[PDB]
Design a binder for this molecule. Structure first.
Ligand SMILES: CC[C@@H](C(=O)OC)[C@@H]1N=C(c2ccc(Cl)cc2)c2ccc(OC)cc2-n2c(C)nnc21
Ligand SMILES: C[C@H](O)COC[C@H](C)O
Ligand SMILES: [Cl-]
Length: 112
């Protein structure tokens, strides 16, 4: 697959951290694709045109889909944006998204 660039190594590090046990209390809703039928949210795919989640980001990293850090970051941010778009701002899952995005943005800012 070829060695990840230095910046994408940092991105992969961030991804591993987001999936790690220390953040699980607020990261878990973002681990896998939203299953709209399972959750009973039958309007989800009318509202969210481009679903994203951490397992999909991980697959894309493993498959070398991301050509740079910017592309990676856009997907992680898309995941958070979908959450902010679908849910009311006072929902528990939105608070969790904000917390995980704080973890993400502060470490992404430490890009070599
Ligand atoms: C799908 C919409 C929303 C919902 O109303 O579910 C019933 C959902 N809430 C939740 C959610 C609701 C309350 C709390 Cl405390 C945590 C997550 C949700 C749950 C599981 C899951 O994957 C297994 C994804 C979730 N998620 C994400 C991401 N963004 N919005 C949600
Ligand atoms: C809570 C906002 O939607 C995202 O905040 C990012 C900041 C680094 O906490
Ligand atoms: Cl972006």
């Amino acid at each position: 697959m070829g060695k990840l660039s230095e910046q994408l190594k940092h991105c992969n590090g961030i991804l591993k951290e987001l999936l790690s046990k220390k953040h699980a209390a607020y990261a878990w809703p973002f681990y896998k694709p939203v299953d709209a039928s399972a959750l009973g949210v039958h309007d989800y795919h009318d509202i969210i045109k481009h679903p994203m989640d951490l397992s999909t980001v991980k697959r894309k990293m493993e498959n070398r889909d991301y050509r740079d850090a910017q592309e990676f970051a856009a997907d992680v941010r898309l995941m958070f944006s979908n959450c902010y778009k679908y849910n009311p701002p006072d929902h528990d899952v939105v608070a969790m998204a904000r917390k995980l995005q704080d973890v993400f943005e502060f470490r992404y800012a430490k890009m070599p």
